[PDB]
């Protein structure tokens, strides 16, 4: 039922750098445009896509430099619209709307590209206060003994936010613009590998398991 004679190889493929460190489609947000809102806001986290979330959660601590590649896409009901991708670091007010003063900043880095141009790239360096990203955190963000402070959220782990604005928002045509975000870690250093997760997910903010049953992982013989 098989024909496998696999010769011995090197350890190049099974490097942590080559495992975690390559582009993955994390965000696929779409925006209608017709006859003020529908700007792109996205929190930088590895927890949005289940596959990459599990692959990252195999380890406790890990440092990397993040290549964010934005792929535009136009879907008319093609004009070369101008797109601006602004990387707002943690502790800066988020763009309230498309026509917001935060876009005209002298401190927030950004890129100007267009649809027909190659997809845009930024390389955000290792950004956290803490000397390594912690996938799991057995603590609290604040000191208050209240439900207001969420459990297992390190506020240093935030990588900042990415905000994409379609500069040519007002156009004669009614369409949809879909932004694709690709995240690629670089110079990944990992410490304290974790037990691989089995059960599915509920939310990015919490590690609750709902349930291959919670009383038996492997399909019983």
């Amino acid at each position: 039922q098989t024909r496998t004679v696999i010769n011995m190889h090197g350890t190049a493929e099974c490097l942590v750098e080559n495992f975690l460190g390559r582009s993955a489609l994390v965000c696929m947000r779409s925006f209608e445009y017709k006859n003020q809102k529908n700007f792109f806001i996205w929190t930088l986290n590895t927890r949005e896509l289940v596959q990459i979330r599990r692959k990252m959660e195999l380890f406790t601590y890990l440092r990397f430099d993040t290549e964010i590649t934005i792929v535009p896409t136009l879907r008319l009901f093609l004009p070369n619209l101008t797109l601006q991708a602004m990387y707002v670091p943690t502790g800066a007010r988020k763009p309230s709307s498309q026509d917001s003063f935060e876009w005209q900043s002298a401190c927030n880095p950004s890129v100007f590209f267009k649809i027909n141009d190659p997809p845009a790239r930024l390389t955000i360096p290792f950004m956290s206060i803490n000397s390594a990203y912690a996938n799991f955190y057995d603590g609290f963000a604040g000191f208050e003994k209240k439900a207001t402070v969420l459990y297992g959220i390190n506020p240093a782990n935030t990588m900042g936010n990415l905000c994409l604005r379609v500069v040519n928002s007002y156009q004669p045509v009614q369409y949809t613009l879909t932004v694709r975000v690709y995240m690629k870690p670089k110079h990944i250093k990992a410490w304290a590998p974790r037990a691989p997760r089995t059960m599915p997910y509920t939310n990015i903010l919490n590690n609750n398991y709902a349930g291959n049953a919670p009383t038996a992982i492997v399909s019983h013989r």
Binding site: Y137, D138, F143, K145, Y151, G152, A195, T198, Y209
Partner: protein, 218 residues
């Protein structure tokens, strides 16, 4: 007969005291007689038990001079020597798995909301696994051996030793609401000292020693 500072504890060491990931704990303005063994309350290992867990900085926030310094000082940095003794006769049987999970994010079953400060921060009392099989982590107990692990087998190996270094992505952190380590004692095979249940207790004794302890801010 081990002894750090003033307190002493009688041990039954018969094999190399394995350091967690082979790193002996060390400290490196911030900095001293509180480096002593604290023996936590004995826990009944009944045949129907699930598994216990102590969060070490949480477990020592209220214990003696260490607790006093943690309450006073705004930071800390401390390695932990954990000694676990399952006390039983030659007649008893079973296996305790001692796993020192780094950053053991507690996970409730069949709920949306996360665990609150009450369910996570037991303190000296310690916690109990709702689902030992899944470590209350979404992981598997089968996969729990990646963490610093040891076995108390009621035949041969009647005591376990763990030596946890400073596992954190900062040189120093806060004890009041962060838990670097979680020492979990889980019964893999149920206790079966079938003596007509004359004494089903077979109590477990935990002893934690904060080694290379330093703090910042008097």
């Amino acid at each position: 007969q081990l002894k750090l500072g003033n307190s002493s504890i009688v041990t039954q060491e018969a094999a190399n005291i394995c350091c967690a990931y082979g790193e002996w704990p060390t400290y490196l303005k911030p900095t001293t007689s509180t480096d002593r063994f604290y023996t936590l309350k004995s826990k009944k290992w009944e045949s129907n038990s699930t598994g216990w867990w102590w969060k070490l900085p949480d477990a020592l926030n209220q214990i003696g001079m260490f607790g006093q310094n943690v309450q006073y000082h705004y930071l800390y940095r401390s390695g932990f020597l954990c000694h676990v003794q399952c006390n039983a006769t030659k007649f008893h049987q079973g296996t305790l798995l001692i796993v020192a999970i780094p950053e053991h994010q507690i996970g409730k079953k069949g709920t949306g909301t996360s665990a609150s400060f009450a369910e996570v921060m037991k303190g000296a009392e310690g916690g109990v696994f709702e689902q030992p099989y899944l470590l209350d982590d979404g992981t598997s107990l089968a996969c729990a051996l990646v963490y610093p692990h040891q076995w108390i087998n009621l035949r041969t190996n009647n005591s376990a030793t763990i030596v946890l270094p400073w596992m954190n992505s900062a040189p120093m952190d806060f004890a009041l609401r962060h838990n670097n380590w979680t020492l979990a004692v889980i019964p893999v095979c149920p206790l079966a000292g079938g003596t007509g249940n004359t004494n089903t207790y077979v109590p477990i004794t935990i002893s934690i020693a904060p080694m290379c302890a330093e703090y910042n801010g008097l």
